[PDB]
Design a protein around this nucleic acid. Sequence first.
RNA 1: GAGUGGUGGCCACUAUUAUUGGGCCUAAAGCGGCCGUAGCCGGGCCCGUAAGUCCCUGGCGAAAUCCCACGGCUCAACCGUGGG
RNA 2: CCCGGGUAGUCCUGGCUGUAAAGGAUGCGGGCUAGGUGUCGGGCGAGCUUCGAGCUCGCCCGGUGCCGUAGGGAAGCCGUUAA
Lengths: 57, 196, 48, 229, 61, 129, 151, 89
Amino acid sequence: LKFEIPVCTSCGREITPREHATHFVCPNCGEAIIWRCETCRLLAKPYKCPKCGWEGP
Amino acid sequence: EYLVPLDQYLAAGVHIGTQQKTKDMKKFIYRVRQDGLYVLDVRKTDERLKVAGKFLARFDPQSILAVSVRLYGQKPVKKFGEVTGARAIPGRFLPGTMTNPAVKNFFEPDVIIITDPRADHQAMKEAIEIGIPIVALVDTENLLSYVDLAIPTNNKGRKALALIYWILAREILYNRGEISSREEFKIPVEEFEMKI
Amino acid sequence: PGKKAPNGEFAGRKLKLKRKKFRWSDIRYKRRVLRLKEKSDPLEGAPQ
Amino acid sequence: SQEWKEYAKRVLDEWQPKTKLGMLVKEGQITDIHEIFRKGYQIKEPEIIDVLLPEVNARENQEILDIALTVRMTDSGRRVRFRVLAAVGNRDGYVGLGIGHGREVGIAIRKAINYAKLNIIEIKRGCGSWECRCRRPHSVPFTVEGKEGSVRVKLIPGPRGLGLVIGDVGKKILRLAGIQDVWSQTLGETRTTVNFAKAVFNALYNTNKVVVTPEMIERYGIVVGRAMP
Amino acid sequence: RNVIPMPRSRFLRVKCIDCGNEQIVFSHPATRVRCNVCGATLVEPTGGKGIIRAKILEVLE
Amino acid sequence: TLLDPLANALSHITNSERVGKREVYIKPASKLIGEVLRVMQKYGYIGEFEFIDDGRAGVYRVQLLGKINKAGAIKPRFPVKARDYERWEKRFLPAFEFGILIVSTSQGVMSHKEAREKGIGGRLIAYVY
Amino acid sequence: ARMHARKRGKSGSKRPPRTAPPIWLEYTVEDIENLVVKLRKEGYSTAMIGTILRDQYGIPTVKLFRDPDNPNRKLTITRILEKHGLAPEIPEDLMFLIKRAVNLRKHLEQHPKDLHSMRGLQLIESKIRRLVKYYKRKGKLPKDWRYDPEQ
Amino acid sequence: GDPKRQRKKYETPPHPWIKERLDRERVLMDKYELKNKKELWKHETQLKNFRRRARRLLAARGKQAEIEREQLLARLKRLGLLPEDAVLD
RNA sequence: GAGUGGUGGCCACUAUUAUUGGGCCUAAAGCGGCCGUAGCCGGGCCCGUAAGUCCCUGGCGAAAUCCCACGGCUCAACCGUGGG
RNA sequence: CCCGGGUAGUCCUGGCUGUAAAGGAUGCGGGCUAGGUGUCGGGCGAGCUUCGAGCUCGCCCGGUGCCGUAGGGAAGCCGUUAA
Ligand SMILES: [Mg+2]
Ligand SMILES: [Mg+2]
Ligand SMILES: [Mg+2]
Ligand SMILES: [Mg+2]
Ligand SMILES: [Mg+2]
Ligand SMILES: [Mg+2]
Ligand SMILES: [Mg+2]
Ligand SMILES: [Mg+2]
Ligand SMILES: [Mg+2]
Ligand SMILES: [Mg+2]
Ligand SMILES: [Mg+2]
Ligand SMILES: [Mg+2]
Ligand SMILES: [Mg+2]
Ligand SMILES: [Mg+2]
Ligand SMILES: [Mg+2]
Ligand SMILES: [Mg+2]
Ligand SMILES: [Zn+2]
Ligand SMILES: [Zn+2]
Ligand SMILES: [Zn+2]
Ligand SMILES: [Zn+2]
């Protein structure tokens, strides 16, 4: 079996091997994992939790 | 309802902004006064403080880093690190602290707290390179670039910084279960602020 | 300088004219067509 | 392969990690090479690659791309310095490129090999040529481009058994990554070896920036990292 | 949002002070607006919005 | 002055998708742009789109999903025969079935795959991949 | 941009999208036609009649009523004037440009050294020639009609 | 125009002095006991032609293409170069 | 390798002629500035036509030369029968 | 080259000549692609006022500067006044 590639929560694109991305548990509920790619972090794009709906950087 | 009464917020000067604004900060701006000075919304600050208190309680206590170059913020971060057990670096941030393993005080945290993105630019720049979440206190002048969780407040006043760090420490202690109620935290706010 | 011109579908004549016009700036092409070497060669095009 | 297993075992026991990722590798919480990518970690200890990809120390998996000597002028004469450009790979899915400086050639070679390990990346391979549709990872899955300095490089999929239709620097770099057939086009000054190598490296890296659908993975036989028979 | 252009001017229903007549006038006139009955001046033109010398009854849609 | 409404729409889309916009507005609308948008949506490159009526030629509102590498118009609109699609694919596309060419035929606007299935030619007007 | 000065002014009208006349408008089609004829007989330009109708009578553009005789098209001021025989013989903008050119020429007779004003005359005559070509193409002017300043 | 001129049936290397190619060809020449390089090159050209026919027919369609495809396969397996159940790839 | 070198010519090298596919701030290169004739490029909707354009099908574009399979000279070069 | 004098010319009227590092060393029209901060003209809103065609703040359009994100470039650098 192969492995899965992480996907940005905001834009839905894949994470390249050596970019300045980040990931962390949801601040509000702590049940889901948020991924942010370098471009989304640079431009301050908002993100939304898939479980509780809390949103925003 | 609120962590503290709004009168205390207004007395500490949390809502006072600066003469300049930024496009991405307008989600927090309440209004602009006749002298060209911008005002922050305090309810947003309370909600973000509650969320940040919930978020920071899940990390290992000694893997948290708080920094403050500004003079008025050095005492609050020191007291905050003393109370919660997190590491604190007041004053100049030595370059290479997080990227140079040969430095004597090399250290890699899991999450960082930035008092002011403009003043603490070196620490933020090094934090970007190691891929950790960033929590910052932002004023009407700052940009939200590379900020993963934002807390809108005045980050230049003395009483404002003291109150913010006092509230955050109490929230972390309450969320991780070391105090059974909000009232048990018997430490005066005046103990966090720089004197004279 | 804008986009290279002409690009129109019915602009073939002008495009061909332009290419022919600027080909004379190539020194190799000019000497071959005008036969400049044959005019001054003491050997008259022979190899020996 | 048998030599490198025991080599990695020997390296692992006597190594004292200094960073967080090194600690994760030492304690056995990370056991595969693919788990250190795509999450923003910083890589500062060469022993990580030695433990996870031991075969990059084989003599056939290393290449000295170029050696040059450069001069600094002083009132007491000329000070000479060596610049070495080198590359490493596992001939399956991972490749790294590095530059080292030194007062003598051996030091520069050692440092250049050391920096190549820290710049290691993983790529995607497949078959996307119009006249060869075999679903086997012997070429690039689609056309890609890279650039550095004045050099522009475009890589085009090729049929199986064609060979590497590219300059020698590109030949070595592509061979170290596990690619057998390709077509190419270039612009600019290819005689500047450093820029040529960097452009080829960037073109290889840009295979991860092309959006794809699940059907395409089946259609072109796209493989990420090791082929894994 | 603002894709459809929407005017900033309005039509107004006003009453003449002298005659008592009611009219409908434009809020950004380019001429002098006078009552259709008595001829008294109702709106004075300016660079932008006009000056109203009558009594405003209603701002029409 | 304005010369080609279709080229502006595609250039606008590809400019917007590179900075992570979630929706765009195409200012001069036309039937041809609607057909191109329908074809693009059929293959999953865009989301839903709608027509907004002003007193002028109308506007299109389009939702983006971040699934486009590049989109452009083809000028001039070369005629192409029913068995000559491969060289244009090599000219515009990166792999042997990567993306679509958009063709206007006497049976409507369609991708070149459907046109090749029907065995007809037409005029090339755009490429998306 | 501007035809000659290459500036990028944007000022203009912003007409909302609507089809039917508003509810609060009470004039009928015949009243509007009578008003237009009266204003024309007072000696106003076509552009001025609409301005007066908008400002004083509270009538937004008359292009909100269908033509009673031709249902396929909407109503305009020029069509209303044509229905009564009061329409201009020469299109109005051409007439205005010609009138501006005549006045400027007699200024340049007493000021032969005013070279900066002469370029304005040249630009005006360029506009006039563009317009006369367009109107000849559409049949609004006789084919033999010519512009001669010496007239 | 010009009448037909008979052409060589083999191709020479693009560069005469490449170390890797020289080593590989020397190994082959020693193993199979050929007289000169051109003989070897002759066989190489044969191989290339086969491949160039396979590449052209993969990207083709129609009635003549199928005939030529089956003819190529039959010829190749008549020489003993392919098994009886091989495909174009 | 029974061949192997010298001199001249054409193509490639060359994206140093650029439709595919080049350039013009500081390296070769934006007319000192503007107006305008031919040419080229030209906004949105509805109806008609069928010149361009696409598809199907009749009559043509000699043979030799090119590609493929099979057959005859020992195999080949060469030649014949078919398909392009 | 510095100092004391000095003809043509520099000035006006009517013509001719058509040249400059005539340089933003950057041809012109259209669509699109983060922000921040000065200044000139017009318009809108709010607050002051000695009631001034006055003062301060905010927003829209058009000019004129600086710092800068993505992208571009051999680099210097350019960056919604695009290179
Ligand atoms: Mg010295
Ligand atoms: Mg570069
Ligand atoms: Mg002959
Ligand atoms: Mg040469
Ligand atoms: Mg060149
Ligand atoms: Mg010029
Ligand atoms: Mg010039
Ligand atoms: Mg049109
Ligand atoms: Mg026809
Ligand atoms: Mg024949
Ligand atoms: Mg025989
Ligand atoms: Mg035979
Ligand atoms: Mg024969
Ligand atoms: Mg000058
Ligand atoms: Mg401006
Ligand atoms: Mg800049
Ligand atoms: Zn993203
Ligand atoms: Zn949540
Ligand atoms: Zn293949
Ligand atoms: Zn009255």
